[PDB]
Amino acid sequence: STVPRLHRPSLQHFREQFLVPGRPVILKGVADHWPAMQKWSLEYIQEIAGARTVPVEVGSRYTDEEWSQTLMTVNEFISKYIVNEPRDVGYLACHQLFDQIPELKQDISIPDYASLGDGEEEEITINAWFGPQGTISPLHQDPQQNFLVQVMGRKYIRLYSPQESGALYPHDTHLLHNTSQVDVENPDLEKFPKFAKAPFLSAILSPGEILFIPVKYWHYVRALDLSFSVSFWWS
Numbered sequence: 001s002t003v004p005r006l007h008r009p010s011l012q013h014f015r016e017q018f019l020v021p022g023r024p025v026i027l028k029g030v031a032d033h034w035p036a037m038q039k040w041s042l043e044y045i046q047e048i049a050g051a052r053t054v055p056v057e058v059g060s061r062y063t064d065e066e067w068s069q070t071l072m073t074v075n076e077f078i079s080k081y082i083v084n085e086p087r088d089v090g091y092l093a094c095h096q097l098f099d100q101i102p103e104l105k106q107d108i109s110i111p112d113y114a115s116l117g118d119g120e121e122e123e124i125t126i127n128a129w130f131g132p133q134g135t136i137s138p139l140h141q142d143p144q145q146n147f148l149v150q151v152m153g154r155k156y157i158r159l160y161s162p163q164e165s166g167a168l169y170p171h172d173t174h175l176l177h178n179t180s181q182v183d184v185e186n187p188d189l190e191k192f193p194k195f196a197k198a199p200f201l202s203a204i205l206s207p208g209e210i211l212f213i214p215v216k217y218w219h220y221v222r223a224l225d226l227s228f229s230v231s232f233w234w235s
């Protein structure tokens, strides 16, 4: 089953049919006019952010043993992990780039739907997710609502309800208890047999689209192209 797509639903419709019951949806016609949609290119990103230091995750998946985190400039990240035939997967993941670079904040907008939350606009966390084709964020859940906005490229996204948590075999450790032990796209069904029958939603999220990921919904994300997404974590 595919995540439903709705064009600019009213605040009330979003609240009653999606936010309150905790059901995912893709919102169209909302972020398609961010300036970012037309302005953000590798060249623009280099011009505005190239000299700044960013954290970069190196390795296929953050659950891997060889996975690590390092620091480099945005120019270095683009050169080593996007443009030149990269040797390893690098991902500028989960970074508050817009607090670091306020000029880029002018190219985005917080969706009006976030004002249905009980939290302060000031406390919404805005993260950049910028990387090559093939980045993977393993199946995990977050403690706030999320609007994940796709700017450049496409992502394949799989969503499992919190009701299905048993079939997802969360890690026992404290660092990883919000992360599944299962590789979604190649699950070990001898070790994790309950995963096979667990229902899910999926989508390909394209530029200009917003995915609403309800609080605690399990999500898995693979970039299909050079990709730039912006998430808003809110309550």
Ligand SMILES: O=C(O)CNC(=O)C(=O)O
Residues within 6 Å of the ligand: 129, 135, 136, 137, 142, 146, 148, 219, 221, 222, 229, 231
């Ligand atoms: O985009 C990705 O790779 C992963 N995104 C998230 O987990 C998020 O926005 O919370």
Ligand SMILES: [Mn+2]
Residues within 6 Å of the ligand: 140, 141, 142, 219
């Ligand atoms: Mn997440």
